A paper describes a structure:
GFP is a relatively small, inert, non-toxic globular protein that readily diffuses throughout cells and can be genetically encoded allowing non-invasive fluorescence visualization of target cells or proteins in live and fixed samples. GFP is a small, folded protein and the entirety of the β-barrel structure is required for chromophore formation and fluorescence. Recently, we applied Cellular High-throughput Encapsulation, Solubilisation and Screening (CHESS)-based directed evolution to superfolder GFP (sfGFP) and identified a GFP variant, termed ultra-stable GFP (usGFP), with superior stability when subjected to SDS and high temperatures.
The crystal structure of usGFP was solved at 1.9 Å resolution in order to probe the structural basis of increased stability. Two usGFP molecules were present in the asymmetric unit and each showed the expected 11-stranded β-barrel structure with an internal coaxial α-helix preceding the fluorophore. L69 of usGFP was situated in the core of the β-barrel, making direct contact with the chromophore. Thus, improved hydrophobic packing in this region due to the Q69L mutation may be responsible, in part, for the increased stability of usGFP. In sfGFP, a water molecule occupies a cavity in the vicinity of the Q69 side chain within the protein. In contrast, the usGFP structure shows no electron density in the equivalent position, indicating that this water molecule is absent. The N164Y mutation of usGFP was located on the outer surface of the β-barrel on β-strand 8, and participated in crystal contacts via van der Waals interactions with G232 from the C-terminal α-helix of neighbouring, symmetry related molecules. The side chain hydroxyl group of the substituted residue, Y164, of usGFP formed intramolecular hydrogen bonds with the side chains of K166 and D180. Examination of the interface between the two molecules of the asymmetric unit of usGFP showed that this created a buried surface area of 823 Å2 (7.7% total surface area), determined using PISA20. The experimental scattering profile for usGFP fitted significantly better to the theoretical scattering profile of the dimer (χ = 3.81) than to the monomer (χ = 10.11).
Numbering used by the authors:
A (entry chain B): 2 to 64, 68 to 237
B (entry chain A): 1 to 64, 68 to 238
The structure:
């Protein structure tokens, strides 16, 4: 795609999220940069409305898969970069086991030289003293796989994965992610064969930042394409 | 699928000790940190305990614990590195810097109590006086790579090959070919794998509180390249 050429260097990123969970509103703004050749992202997020009413780890997946490292042999299967520069809509339902649900809608696109992710998030049916609204999640993150398949009828993709959030008592809070992406433009996009992305995330704090915030390093790498060749062999 | 796998289900402390000699320039490095194999994650800080490193930090990354790789459930029977524990394995490499010299390394990786220890000797020869390595012309960063692995039935271990791409300060790339062998230290049985690869990603940084010559490293290593029937069914 012509879109993949936009990612050959380090690209600045802007993230803007407006959220409402059980009526608790908040906004998050993030900035940083992405290096898709190595599949690497670094960002700092601030809650601009004061205190975040949910744990930061619950927002990581919502807060730019166009920065995934796609191996040379799998370039034809990178939908995210192929939709650029006009971009794509990413929508999810995230179901927290035994608790509430987030519904998200994001637009990911270039504005000038910057890759912007603008998100609206609505959360409902959370327990006021559950793991989420009770802030019982550890400030850390696990490695996951994002499973991707084409959705020809929407000219896009679907994905599924299950996030594991460590809870302060030693338990694990599961969050099922149901995802769809569709291009914003009408130009042609690449629809992939089935594959997955391996993800790793590291969360930290800036010691000179007084606002409620999260520093994030993330790696995302594509794998799992069965070429006819090795299916033969 | 091995007993050794059980030693890696949580966070394991790591100690790394390296003695090096590159064209007669001697040095030592000590590293400490921890590994979380469930997530394929390593966090370490290394100090050059002899003062200044005579080679670029990036050239030592690969030498300075693949037992911390995340193997997917369906590939756990191919995890040689964990299966050799706790007695451990010897890891040897020849690393050829294209158009420059060579490192030869020998390391023992094993548990000493609750700590996973990597103790290494490195000898470097034939480096060019004008070159990217002794000239310190390499950027302080690292790229993502694939480590290719195959069984070595004759030595009851494995062999590996990969090509590291080091960014050079003028925009070129300095290649480093890695040839690797691993063999178990103990007698116990080990898992000999089908061909596969490890996908690696690394971030180099500095600790603002540390005034010694040092490198902070975060790394992710995940096994791949062996498919499973449920994934293939729907392709
Ligand atoms: Cl250096």
């Amino acid at each position: 795609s012509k879109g993949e050429e936009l990612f050959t260097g380090v690209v600045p990123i802007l993230v803007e999220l407006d959220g409402d969970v059980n009526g608790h509103k908040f906004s998050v703004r993030g900035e940083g940069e992405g290096d898709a050749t190595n599949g690497k992202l670094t960002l700092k997020f601030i809650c601009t409305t004061g205190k975040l009413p949910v744990p930061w780890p619950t927002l990581v997946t919502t807060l730019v898969l166009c920065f995934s490292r796609y191996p040379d042999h799998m370039k034809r299967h990178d939908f995210f970069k192929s939709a650029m520069p006009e971009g794509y809509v990413q929508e999810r339902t995230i179901s927290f086991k035994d608790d509430g649900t987030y519904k998200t809608r994001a637009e990911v696109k270039f504005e000038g030289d910057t890759l912007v992710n603008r998100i609206e998030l609505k959360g409902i049916d959370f327990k006021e003293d559950g793991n989420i609204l009770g802030h019982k999640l550890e400030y850390n993150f696990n490695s996951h796989n994002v499973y991707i398949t084409a959705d020809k009828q929407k000219n896009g993709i679907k994905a599924y994965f299950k996030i594991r959030h460590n809870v302060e008592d030693g338990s694990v809070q599961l969050a099922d992610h149901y995802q769809q992406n569709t291009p914003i433009g009408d130009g042609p996009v690449l629809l992939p064969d089935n594959h997955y992305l391996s993800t790793q995330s590291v969360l930290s704090k800036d010691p000179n930042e007084k606002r409620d915030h999260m520093v994030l390093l993330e790696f995302v790498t594509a794998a799992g394409i069965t070429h006819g060749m090795d299916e033969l062999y």
